[PDB]
Design an enzyme around this catalytic site. Sequence first.
Site, PDB file in Angstrom:
ATOM      1  N   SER B  29      93.876  78.878  -3.588  1.00 40.60           N
ATOM      2  CA  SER B  29      94.409  80.026  -2.859  1.00 40.60           C
ATOM      3  C   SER B  29      93.479  80.507  -1.750  1.00 40.60           C
ATOM      4  O   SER B  29      92.303  80.149  -1.708  1.00 40.60           O
ATOM      5  CB  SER B  29      94.710  81.178  -3.831  1.00 40.60           C
ATOM      6  OG  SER B  29      95.349  82.266  -3.172  1.00 40.60           O
ATOM      7  N   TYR B  32      95.627  83.971   3.206  1.00 40.99           N
ATOM      8  CA  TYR B  32      96.903  83.559   3.808  1.00 40.99           C
ATOM      9  C   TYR B  32      98.042  83.500   2.786  1.00 40.99           C
ATOM     10  O   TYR B  32      99.084  84.122   2.986  1.00 40.99           O
ATOM     11  CB  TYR B  32      96.750  82.204   4.526  1.00 40.99           C
ATOM     12  CG  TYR B  32      96.101  81.135   3.673  1.00 40.99           C
ATOM     13  CD1 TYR B  32      94.746  80.842   3.782  1.00 40.99           C
ATOM     14  CD2 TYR B  32      96.841  80.429   2.740  1.00 40.99           C
ATOM     15  CE1 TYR B  32      94.157  79.863   2.972  1.00 40.99           C
ATOM     16  CE2 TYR B  32      96.265  79.452   1.934  1.00 40.99           C
ATOM     17  CZ  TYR B  32      94.932  79.177   2.047  1.00 40.99           C
ATOM     18  OH  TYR B  32      94.406  78.208   1.227  1.00 40.99           O
ATOM     19  N   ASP B 147      92.485  77.791  14.286  1.00 34.92           N
ATOM     20  CA  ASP B 147      92.700  77.525  12.866  1.00 34.92           C
ATOM     21  C   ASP B 147      92.373  76.070  12.507  1.00 34.92           C
ATOM     22  O   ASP B 147      92.126  75.761  11.344  1.00 34.92           O
ATOM     23  CB  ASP B 147      94.138  77.858  12.457  1.00 34.92           C
ATOM     24  CG  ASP B 147      94.513  79.318  12.718  1.00 34.92           C
ATOM     25  OD1 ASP B 147      95.449  79.549  13.502  1.00 34.92           O
ATOM     26  OD2 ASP B 147      93.887  80.233  12.140  1.00 34.92           O
TER      27      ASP B 147
HETATM   28  C1  LIG Z   1      93.250  74.795  -2.118  1.00 30.90           C
HETATM   29  C2  LIG Z   1      93.255  73.305  -2.452  1.00 30.90           C
HETATM   30  N1  LIG Z   1      94.051  72.487  -1.756  1.00 30.90           N
HETATM   31  C3  LIG Z   1      94.101  71.170  -2.004  1.00 30.90           C
HETATM   32  N2  LIG Z   1      94.915  70.383  -1.277  1.00 30.90           N
HETATM   33  C4  LIG Z   1      95.704  70.827  -0.277  1.00 30.90           C
HETATM   34  N3  LIG Z   1      96.382  70.051   0.587  1.00 30.90           N
HETATM   35  C5  LIG Z   1      97.110  70.736   1.503  1.00 30.90           C
HETATM   36  C6  LIG Z   1      97.031  72.074   1.377  1.00 30.90           C
HETATM   37  C7  LIG Z   1      97.710  73.154   2.220  1.00 30.90           C
HETATM   38  O1  LIG Z   1      97.350  74.325   2.129  1.00 30.90           O
HETATM   39  N4  LIG Z   1      98.693  72.747   3.016  1.00 30.90           N
HETATM   40  C8  LIG Z   1      99.343  73.622   3.780  1.00 30.90           C
HETATM   41  C9  LIG Z   1     100.584  74.142   3.377  1.00 30.90           C
HETATM   42  C10 LIG Z   1     101.240  73.733   2.055  1.00 30.90           C
HETATM   43  C11 LIG Z   1     101.252  75.052   4.196  1.00 30.90           C
HETATM   44  C12 LIG Z   1     100.688  75.449   5.404  1.00 30.90           C
HETATM   45  C13 LIG Z   1      99.452  74.937   5.801  1.00 30.90           C
HETATM   46  C14 LIG Z   1      98.778  74.023   4.995  1.00 30.90           C
HETATM   47 CL1  LIG Z   1      97.243  73.406   5.516  1.00 30.90          CL
HETATM   48  S1  LIG Z   1      96.032  72.435   0.110  1.00 30.90           S
HETATM   49  C15 LIG Z   1      93.293  70.640  -3.019  1.00 30.90           C
HETATM   50  C16 LIG Z   1      92.469  71.512  -3.742  1.00 30.90           C
HETATM   51  N5  LIG Z   1      91.602  71.072  -4.767  1.00 30.90           N
HETATM   52  C17 LIG Z   1      90.131  71.197  -4.507  1.00 30.90           C
HETATM   53  C18 LIG Z   1      89.341  70.074  -5.193  1.00 30.90           C
HETATM   54  N6  LIG Z   1      89.774  69.973  -6.601  1.00 30.90           N
HETATM   55  C19 LIG Z   1      88.786  69.324  -7.498  1.00 30.90           C
HETATM   56  C20 LIG Z   1      88.662  67.798  -7.278  1.00 30.90           C
HETATM   57  O2  LIG Z   1      87.753  67.230  -8.238  1.00 30.90           O
HETATM   58  C21 LIG Z   1      91.179  69.512  -6.717  1.00 30.90           C
HETATM   59  C22 LIG Z   1      92.131  70.556  -6.075  1.00 30.90           C
HETATM   60  N7  LIG Z   1      92.469  72.823  -3.430  1.00 30.90           N
END
Ligand SMILES: Cc1nc(Nc2ncc(C(=O)Nc3c(C)cccc3Cl)s2)cc(N2CCN(CCO)CC2)n1
Lengths: 331, 331
Positions: B29, B32, B147
Amino acid sequence: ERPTFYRQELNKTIWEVPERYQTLSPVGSGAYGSVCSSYDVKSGLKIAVKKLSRPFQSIIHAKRTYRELRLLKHMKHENVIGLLDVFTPATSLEEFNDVYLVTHLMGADLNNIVKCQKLTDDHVQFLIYQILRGLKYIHSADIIHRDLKPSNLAVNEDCELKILDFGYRAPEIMLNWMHYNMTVDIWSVGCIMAELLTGRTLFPGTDHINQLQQIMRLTGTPPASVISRMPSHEARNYINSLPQMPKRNFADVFIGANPLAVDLLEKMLVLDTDKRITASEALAHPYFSQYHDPDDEPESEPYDQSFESRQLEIEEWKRLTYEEVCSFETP
Amino acid sequence: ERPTFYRQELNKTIWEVPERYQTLSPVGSGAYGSVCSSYDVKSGLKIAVKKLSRPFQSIIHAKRTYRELRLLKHMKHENVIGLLDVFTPATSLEEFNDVYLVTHLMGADLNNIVKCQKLTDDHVQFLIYQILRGLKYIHSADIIHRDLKPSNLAVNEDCELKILDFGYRAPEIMLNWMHYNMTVDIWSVGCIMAELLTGRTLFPGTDHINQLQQIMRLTGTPPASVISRMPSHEARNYINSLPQMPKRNFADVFIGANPLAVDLLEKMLVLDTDKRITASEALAHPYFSQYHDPDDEPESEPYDQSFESRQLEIEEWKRLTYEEVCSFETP
Ligand SMILES: Cc1nc(Nc2ncc(C(=O)Nc3c(C)cccc3Cl)s2)cc(N2CCN(CCO)CC2)n1
Ligand SMILES: Cc1nc(Nc2ncc(C(=O)Nc3c(C)cccc3Cl)s2)cc(N2CCN(CCO)CC2)n1
Ligand SMILES: Cc1nc(Nc2ncc(C(=O)Nc3c(C)cccc3Cl)s2)cc(N2CCN(CCO)CC2)n1
Ligand SMILES: Cc1nc(Nc2ncc(C(=O)Nc3c(C)cccc3Cl)s2)cc(N2CCN(CCO)CC2)n1
């Protein structure tokens, strides 16, 4: 000679302070260390006592500790927070592991000074004059690390003011800091003063880059020299023209204000970093005719910061620190 | 035609999502909005679904919401996060109060790629090539609100990389941002690559101003032009000379590294912002000889950001947003 110390637990941490500092009360905290109000029996004044958070955990913590101790030792100006006492319950260097710094107690942060509503023009004259007097002195010291800023200002109940020491990066960014460190100070003051006369925020953006657009409605657009070297044409487009918003001017924004206040602000809130008013000039301004005393507006003694460019192990910073604690004569 | 939505409570907040997005699992999270992983049945791929936090509370939240929707709608480059879907359970503008944004899922942050220990030189070429391909595209869009950044990069397990949209101020500061917004980007990449090859932070400070002193050890001291206009002689002294620390050189630091990797870094980690290598120049460099395709390195279509200069009430942004949500065709 070691005074009687006494021991107590405040917010799950052990405080061991000299006999003189009674009735400890926690006021607030941050990463740096925790602060307590206390009644110093000796001099009969409500005081501020800070215990540093794990002062010698790392090299950074250790140098940070030494830096603050050296700075508040050097800062001797009625508008800048100063060291009244420093102590440790430890009785040897090996044992040494807890540091306390003591200063005067100010009762109101910046964010409380605004809401502190009913403010005569005289309070504003006095407040701003004190920040400027402090700033002149602060700039004169050429302090490599930046812990004293206008926004760190603090005020006790009769408007007496002191500046406290709180409140991947590319080289071009930090070179820019150094370059404009004094100019940005006078912009902060400008913003601060504005808020004390109106009660509203002066340049409210939707975001930080939109903030530039807001500033320019009052300041005008940058000189050709600044614009002609932006990295793109669309960049120049953003700062070479205001969009057609409703026209706003200084006389309008600060209508009820002492016209000298408006004059002062028109020399503070200027975009041309070179044309902007300097602290010591700002002092000579007619708005501070009551307070302005050209022989009571001191600059600093040189301040030896050779320590900032020494690369040392934790234990070397701890020794320097302990040598200062034991050397300190309590005024 | 509205698909079947289904409803669930995830972390004390109600999520309403189209039939296709099953097995929602929260991953992380930010201010945003919150993000969930989901198995999109239609295209049969693990996806990312973000629900915006109180998107129309204020003007700032509302414009923010609109901006992100316009941005990811415009961004069409395989190294830049793009909008796969946007949706709302609302069925009229008056009802309209919740907005969801859908992209691909990456699953490895920058702070997770460092520690991802055993990486061939090939992985580094590929990772760095994709950020540079990204940055070229990004810089070419002349995006007013920042951004998209190098440090915002994210990676899936086969090292496929995408840049995501997350990871009182004086005019001279933000004017400077604008000025060097491209040059700082190449500094970040330089720093990132350095770490990938080593595993240690390149420029460790005790603090941020001390970091400039660390940088200069490798880069040398600023040109006379940058020096002759510092605001004091003590500032001139900080940046006109290194103190006598051990001599360190690029060849030393990146000892086991591909020598072409070292060559590229000596063109990235340059202090003089003008001499510094640009994204598109960095692409042409011998180090990415197998990846470099000058006809497969596209710039952006113009991006209409006239909206950034509009001052509108919440309700005006909410309508623009709602118009974009209903107009969107899902690829
Ligand atoms: C907060 C987060 N996101 C991850 N992957 C994402 N991919 C794309 C994301 C994103 O927000 N897309 C997006 C959307 C949907 C709308 C508007 C704009 C955007 Cl840019 S978030 C992975 C993660 N992890 C950290 C590492 N952990 C441990 C590994 O051992 C696993 C889990 N944490
Ligand atoms: C955290 C805090 N500190 C306050 N005053 C201080 N004065 C001086 C401080 C200080 O740290 N000195 C110092 C020391 C001791 C060592 C090294 C360096 C320094 Cl600078 S802290 C007031 C305060 N509040 C209570 C009253 N609230 C309502 C107003 O009506 C506002 C909030 N909270
Ligand atoms: C103008 C400025 N200075 C910063 N720090 C400085 N450190 C050291 C400085 C310096 O000039 N020292 C110095 C002096 C005084 C004399 C001789 C020699 C030297 Cl080395 S200036 C940080 C900073 N910003 C970061 C944080 N942003 C808010 C976001 O939360 C606001 C912008 N802006
Ligand atoms: C280089 C830089 N840019 C920042 N923000 C920018 N916003 C808008 C920018 C800009 O050039 N836009 C633009 C473009 C690209 C084209 C045409 C027209 C325009 Cl208007 S650049 C912030 C920033 N910071 C220093 C480091 N701090 C790290 C704290 O952790 C964060 C803050 N550094």
